[PDB]
Design a protein around this ligand. Structure first.
Ligand SMILES: Nc1ncnc2c1ncn2[C@@H]1O[C@H](COP(=O)(O)OP(=O)(O)NP(=O)(O)O)[C@@H](O)[C@H]1O
Ligand SMILES: [Mg+2]
Length: 516
DNA sequence: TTTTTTT
């Protein structure tokens, strides 16, 4: 092994665990020439990895890559070309101002388009297909919503989009009911734990994260082409939070002839990983677009403000249903908590924040919310802070023993010593030790895990202290979680900033590959 | 600099 490492130390730049950054300091602290070609070629790989990590790009034009090397390194804009070029021919980077990718990402994008291709050209079957829509099946649905039921007939891949609150996820209960009546096995999942949880609620069925559906293991996902996921119909919600990699993994596990229904809105939150497949799919596959808003009552300021965010314009606060109260990070959380009390308490208003840490982060908001509505008796320590009877808790990690999965809300029944017994939707259970780090207080929530949920009145904390997270989709997503009233706490300028900042488009050739 | 998933 280290024969490889003595020849080139920057062999870890793309190795498990450690990355370029670490191997770089371990290279400078032990001699190492910042201009050394072995460091440059590695620096180029790091540039692309970072391109996907920070901006979600699947590739970078040769130029932007050389430029990215200069910013994440520091050599001469001429040496960079040699860095990229060396990495290219060394096979550390692939090309196709060619488009350069991390080798596996090009393969990934090519196999993904391929999978989508066959999904779009093959008929659903087991040549076995009795999909038929009984009238009772479109009961309660709108014309547009019902059309999805018809579309799944004769098509293996169907996309269901529409802005927030148009009843996409709701349409899903009907689709699943139909499927079951036809004797088909239905699998339900979403990218985040809480979203999967809500998909389950509105569907009346068991749903999980895309990771648990595929059976995540040490060797990777259990389900794939050799052992497809056991479902005839696959329903995936909140698909805009799915990156290329996960999408590839899910599609590759779809039983041949089986159906896949993707539902989501690209105007909401983009994936944390690279890519944004839903954008391509919503244009290549048969899609039905819902347009009637049901979440908020017709002509509620919220709806108009949401339309404003899509055009870089902040909300016109003032209304009893759309207001903002200025606050600073200093003594901010305390204020937010008092605003909550003034609104009926934690149970009458959901608090949302863009980040977990910081004076206005989820962790500190929780503390003040806990201190204000459930003051007292030093209970059992958990993820952050402690839990005391009466506290609302959120499962954040999967617990197979008791079968409490990421995204489940619970109520602390009692905290005795180091034994925290909680009630997770009827499933009363006792937690001790390690399993205590599987949950956090649930008074405050991040916007990312809020996607897919709705509440009557929402209180979103948005302020300059959230700078890195001030994007248009983020606030559009936060604002639209509200059914009746949306109050904001922070600064009006934060919203102006957020509305004007649309994260840059993600370099992707998925659509091109599907069509070409 | 930050968001998620993870037997
Ligand atoms: N056809 C309908 N008629 C009346 N109410 C409906 C209808 N469809 C959905 N709703 C209600 O609208 C709200 C649900 O919207 P939902 O199905 O979550 O839309 P969505 O597009 O999934 N929103 P989102 O996930 O944020 O993009 C609930 O009050 C549903 O009961
Ligand atoms: Mg939904």
């Amino acid at each position: 092994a280290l024969d490889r490492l003595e020849k080139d130390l920057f062999t870890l730049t793309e190795v498990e665990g450690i990355g370029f950054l670490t191997a770089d300091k371990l290279w400078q602290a032990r001699g190492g020439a910042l201009d050394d070609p072995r460091r440059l070629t590695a620096a180029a790989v790091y540039a692309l990895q970072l391109a996907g990590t920070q901006a979600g790009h699947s590739f970078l034009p040769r130029s932007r890559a050389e430029k990215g090397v200069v910013h994440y390194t520091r050599v001469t804009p001429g040496q960079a070309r040699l860095a990229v070029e060396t990495a290219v021919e060394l096979g550390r980077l692939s090309e196709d101002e060619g488009r350069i990718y991390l080798p596996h990402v090009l393969r990934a994008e090519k196999k993904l388009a391929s999978l989508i291709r066959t999904l779009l050209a093959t008929p659903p079957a087991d040549g076995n297909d009795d999909w038929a829509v009984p009238k009772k099946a479109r009961k309660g649905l709108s014309e547009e919503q019902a059309s999805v039921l018809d579309q799944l007939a004769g098509h293996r891949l169907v996309v269901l989009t529409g802005g927030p609150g148009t009843g996409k996820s709701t349409t899903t209960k009907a689709v699943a009911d139909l499927a079951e009546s036809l004797g088909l096995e239905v699998g339900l999942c979403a990218p985040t734990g809480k979203a999967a949880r809500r998909l389950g609620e509105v569907t009346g069925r068991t749903a999980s994260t895309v990771h648990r559906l595929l059976g995540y293991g040490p060797q990777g996902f259990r389900h794939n082409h050799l052992e497809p996921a056991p479902y005839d119909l696959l329903i995936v919600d909140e698909v805009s939070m799915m990156g290329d990699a996960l999408m590839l993994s899910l599609l590759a596990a779809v039983p041949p002839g089986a159906r896949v229904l993707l539902v989501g809105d690209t105007d909401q939150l983009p994936p944390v990983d690279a890519g944004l497949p839903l954008l391509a799919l919503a244009q290549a596959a048969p899609t039905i677009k819902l347009t009637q808003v049901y979440r908020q009552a017709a002509k509620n300021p919220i709806i108009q403000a949401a339309h404003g965010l899509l055009h870089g314009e902040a909300p016109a606060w003032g209304d009893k249903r759309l207001n903002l109260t200025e606050i600073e990070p200093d003594g901010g959380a305390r204020r937010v908590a008092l605003m909550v009390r003034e609104l009926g308490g934690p149970g009458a208003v959901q608090v949302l924040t863009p980040m977990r840490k910081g004076p206005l982060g989820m962790d500190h908001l929780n503390y003040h919310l806990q201190a204000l509505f459930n003051p007292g008796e030093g209970g059992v320590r958990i993820a952050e802070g402690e839990a005391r009877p009466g506290d609302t808790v959120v499962q954040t990690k999967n617990d197979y023993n008791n079968e409490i999965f990421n995204g489940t809300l619970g109520m602390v029944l009692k905290a005795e010593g180091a034994r925290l017994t909680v009630d997770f939707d009827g499933n009363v259970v006792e937690l001790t030790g390690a399993e205590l780090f599987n949950l956090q207080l649930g008074y405050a929530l991040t916007v990312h895990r809020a996607q897919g949920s709705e509440w009557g009145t929402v209180l979103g904390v948005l302020h300059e202290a959230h700078m890195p997270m001030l994007s248009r989709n983020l606030v559009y997503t936060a604002l639209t979680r509200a059914r009746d009233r949306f109050f904001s706490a922070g600064s009006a300028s934060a919203w102006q900033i957020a509305a004007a900042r649309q994260r840059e488009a993600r370099n992707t050739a998925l659509l091109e590959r599907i069509r070409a």
